[PDB]
Design a protein around this ligand. Structure first.
Ligand SMILES: [Mg+2]
Ligand SMILES: [Mg+2]
Ligand SMILES: [Mg+2]
Ligand SMILES: [Mg+2]
Ligand SMILES: [Mg+2]
Lengths: 383, 377
């Protein structure tokens, strides 16, 4: 179809410039070699391909509309125009993106392979730098090594990490990560259309191991990172870390497209802003308390989604949980209101606090943990 | 006479900069425990500044008698302090121990005194922790409030710098076990009876640490000019002892300036690399100094690996830029080989070691090149 449109590309350029600028600034003026990112299908419908267009800017290509107005090829941007190296990308497409944007997965894969093959210095073309190394490691052609457009298999959705977090059914982060790798390692191949979304787990792991940055786009005024579970479910931050030889956590960012000028913030900063707007905001939680039974369920879900981000990124700082404990548990007026309003959901909140502590996401006093366990025993006797 | 009134005053400024930095990162929550190192020569030179910093952290003032002898403390009231008393794990160097046994006694007595104050636990983190530790260990609160540690009499260092020099270590756990074995000797002002191993309390106190801290005068001796600073760095040690495996925030107070600037350890590493290992003015001057100059480059790289092993705070680009600078700025390889093949071989082992141990992530071609160079060397 027509995407990304000229308008989408103009917005995309600005966001990518801001992301790269911030990363270069935080890391001794150095460009990141690979950005691991997520593309959401509904987003790209609404914006006519803005986040898709961001990938094109990262690698330094521009979309070209044909005589019928359809975007089905790209042309490389010159290194002089780009003004920096081409940055490699691991493109984690959501299941909805895959269902709705086959032609654009084709566009992206073709674009990335074409970039890999440009006769350019590897220090100016990180797609080629990595694809050459991966081709040598695996003994495959450079175009095969330059596979970056991934998703769930046809008919599958999510990493099932939000499902595991909801059920508290998992033992360690490695289990969540192994599930992400098993579920989201299906690749599009524009050189072999008839193959569908085909498993390329070795290349997926190698490409992820090169990532120095993780990135998603959100409109926080519409749907915040904790309003839903799907954003943490697809977050590749800890996954990348676990695949790197150095076990270095990549720098994590979120582009917030609330305002016309989209703000690139760290994931940590995004968590902070959201906690101050939602979970720990008196106007929000009192509003929920005024909504009674269902309001308490919303508070419970918010805390659960926060733990989700801990599990996938480690970017929820201790103060979020400590302040949540002070607000909801240590304040007896609120504690009693919660227990009386929705005992079942309050019990789940207690479990979530205890789980955050047990899993190593929240450090707190022995007395605070004892209080939670007392309240658990008490609410179970009530139910 | 140590710490003097002037040393105590200088100390407060640095303590406040440190705690305010961490408080900011914590959205207003003060760090509950700082694990730090005290150096002996430093405290002689400054008349007890870094020792005085510990006294300010816990909120006590040293008191001089009619002979000018600084031989007890009095608590600063919580109201006058205006923030919580911060718990401290005081890792005294062996030289500090040799010079300042009386001050180790003073400090232990001060910390035990603070632990027993009738104060809110959220305003007195020494007491907060000591109460939990007394219960867990089945000991009295004063015994639980043991925080002043060193090497055993006649011993020095964690032997970590020795291990790093010889590459005679399996993993970070081995280094950490050595630190725990060597540096868990506690001074007991209630016992006079010499030193005693207090490994259980040491581990528990370290496990509460949220910050690590040392004072350096980077204009005189940088963190890589010598090996003793990384040898005593408790950063990864603390992390390993925590249930949550959270790395404490690591800082260095640089006393180059009139009032020390508090920087992250990672920033301190970055500044030093730009000043030394990766500074053309430095390494070419080393090259001009013959055999010994190459040995200095080798040692500098080794000390950098030391900091990786103890803290994880050496950014990848340090090793990457070192490779760009020393390896394959074409003549460089051969010059190192020709000026000092023994040291050049050690540099190759070090680069390969940094990659092998997961401290340096780089291109497969960079690794291959280092291999080829080694074979040639
Ligand atoms: Mg979009
Ligand atoms: Mg999906
Ligand atoms: Mg000093
Ligand atoms: Mg020593
Ligand atoms: Mg700093």
């Amino acid at each position: 179809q027509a995407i990304p449109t000229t308008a989408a590309m103009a917005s995309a350029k600005i966001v990518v410039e801001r992301l790269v600028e911030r990363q270069k600034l935080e890391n001794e003026g150095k460009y990141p070699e690979t950005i691991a990112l997520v593309l959401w299908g509904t987003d790209n419908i609404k914006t006519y391909g803005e986040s898709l267009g961001q990938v094109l800017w990262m690698i330094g290509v521009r979309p070209i509309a044909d005589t019928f107005g359809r975007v089905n090829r790209v042309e490389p941007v010159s290194l002089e125009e780009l003004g920096r190296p081409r940055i490699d990308v691991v493109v984690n497409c959501s299941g909805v993106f895959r269902d709705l944007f086959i032609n654009q997965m084709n566009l992206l894969d073709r674009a990335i392979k074409m970039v890999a093959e440009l006769d350019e210095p590897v220090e100016q073309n990180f797609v080629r730098k990595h694809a050459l190394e991966q081709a040598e490691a695996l003994g495959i052609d450079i175009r095969e090594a330059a596979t970056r457009v991934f998703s769930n298999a046809s008919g599958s959705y999510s990493a099932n990490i939000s499902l595991a977090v909801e059920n508290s059914s998992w033992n360690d982060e490695k289990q969540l990560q192994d599930m992400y790798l098993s579920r989201k390692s299906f690749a599009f191949d524009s050189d072999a259309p008839g193959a569908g979304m085909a498993e390329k787990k070795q290349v997926f792991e190698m490409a992820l191991s090169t990532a120095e940055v993780t990135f998603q786009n959100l409109d926080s005024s519409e749907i915040s990172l904790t309003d839903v579970s799907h954003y943490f479910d697809s977050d590749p931050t800890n996954l990348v870390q676990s695949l790197r030889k150095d076990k270095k956590k990549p720098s994590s960012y979120i582009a917030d497209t609330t305002t016309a000028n989209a703000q690139v913030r760290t994931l940590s900063e995004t968590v902070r802003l959201d906690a101050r707007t939602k979970l720990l905001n008196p106007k929000w939680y009192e509003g929920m308390m005024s909504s009674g039974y269902e309001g308490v369920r919303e508070i419970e879900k918010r805390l659960s989604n926060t733990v989700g981000w801990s599990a996938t990124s480690g970017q929820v700082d201790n103060w979020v949980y400590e302040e949540a404990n002070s607000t909801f548990i240590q304040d007896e007026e609120m504690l009693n209101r919660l227990m009386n309003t929705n005992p079942n959901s309050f019990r789940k909140m207690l479990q979530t606090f205890l789980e955050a502590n047990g899993r190593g996401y929240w450090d707190t006093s022995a007395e605070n943990i004892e209080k939670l366990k007392e309240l658990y025993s008490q609410v179970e006797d009530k139910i």
